[PDB]
Write a protein that binds this ligand. Structure first.
Ligand SMILES: N[C@@H](CCC(=O)N[C@@H](CS)C(=O)NCC(=O)O)C(=O)O
Ligand SMILES: N[C@@H](CCC(=O)N[C@@H](CS)C(=O)NCC(=O)O)C(=O)O
Lengths: 219, 219
């Protein structure tokens, strides 16, 4: 049995899956679909995933789509390279950080959404509201990296970094100068960006396209 | 070591934790906080949870807050009553359903949010948009229950039902007549509502308060 994963460029849910696969060094087959050409809605994809989304994934008769379910399945199916420590108490912290990352999406990426959605309708009395929420959110993670001095959950790479980093990258892709404002996250970013597995899974379309820059003002 | 959980009434994240605790029959200590009196922001809560949210949870030196992390920790710490089957392939389906339930929140509960948020500003040209999304979302789950004939993920109660049911209940609490429109979800609801563990964890404030009814029109 050899895993197969349909995924697109610039998608954190897909990145999570690719990182897990690479980090555990599992040989897999893939189909890099085009979002702009709506390939995530192909019939081939819909048979496996009624929601027409990526990642979509198989491994024999095993079919799983939620990026988080795929990662959990991979951790359980291919145990040789653990992305979780063995200590139950410490694993709890890894799980905490993993799932807590859904907050970045809401409190951070909302800042970008707003400027794009209701554009031309810029209300700085509200703009400064969500901007402060983004910073409040990032502060938590900043403190976390500060607290460990290394990776988002512990002093080693774990499933939590698989969830967190893609979000950090997307933030920087939007142009966040975190160098001085969030020295720990930035230190974490540059550190991670240097990890082989991450260099290998950078979103394909990023190199030859310009940053959306919806965050150039962040900090 | 005895678990301690701070939680509030009518909160799906808290319900998930209570169900897991009850279903595995773990004896725990609790603090039922008042949201209206802002007790989720107490100092006692903030020391353990910098976000000032519930559930907030401890078990010795073990501190975990994300409802999903707590459930995973409980599954791993107290294995006697498994909420997951042993088959790795089948567990994958349980994980799929568990995490996919985050969609109900977005595609379903948005319908309720909108009518509350931008109220008085009712735009039925858009109202009928999200209403159709709610039905599309529920259809997936309807088909799932149809596909199994029993619980949301398999023919037994699993961690997936722990995630799904609270959302179904909240929907009905908003007044959804799913009897004829979603016979399988409704059958699932009445079935679940009858399970001892669920009767015991119904949101405390529901009995003596009226349904918000933001869904009475759903179907
Ligand atoms: N909860 C899913 C979400 C996946 C998702 O949102 N995928 C996007 C790309 S990042 C997609 O394919 N979207 C297409 C759509 O909604 O049609 C996960 O984490 O896997
Ligand atoms: N992702 C968390 C979310 C918890 C959450 O949103 N809790 C709400 C009650 S349902 C809360 O305490 N909210 C207070 C707040 O944001 O201040 C989880 O699932 O545990």
């Amino acid at each position: 049995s050899k895993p197969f994963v349909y995924w697109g460029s610039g998608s954190p849910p897909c990145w999570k899956v690719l990182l897990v696969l690479q980090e555990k060094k599992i040989d897999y087959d893939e189909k890099i679909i085009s979002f702009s050409k709506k390939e995530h809605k192909s019939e081939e994809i819909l048979e496996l995933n009624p929601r027409g989304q990526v990642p979509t994934f198989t491994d024999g008769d095993v079919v799983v789509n939620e990026s988080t379910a795929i990662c959990m399945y991979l951790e359980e199916k291919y145990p040789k390279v653990p992305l979780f420590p063995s200590d139950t108490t410490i694993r709890a912290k890894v799980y905490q950080r993993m799932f807590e990352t859904s907050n970045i999406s809401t409190n951070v990426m909302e800042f970008v959404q707003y400027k794009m959605k209701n554009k031309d309708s810029i209300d700085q009395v509200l703009l400064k509201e969500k901007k402060d929420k983004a910073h409040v959110e990032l502060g938590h993670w900043e403190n976390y990296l500060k607290q460990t001095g290394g990776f988002v959950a512990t002093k080693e790479f774990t499933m939590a970094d698989v969830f967190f980093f893609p979000m950090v990258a997307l933030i920087v892709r939007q142009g966040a100068n975190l160098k001085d404002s969030y020295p720990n996250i930035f230190k974490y970013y540059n550190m991670m960006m240097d990890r082989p597995t991450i260099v290998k899974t950078m979103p394909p379309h990023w190199a030859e396209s310009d940053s959306p820059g919806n965050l150039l003002d962040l900090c």
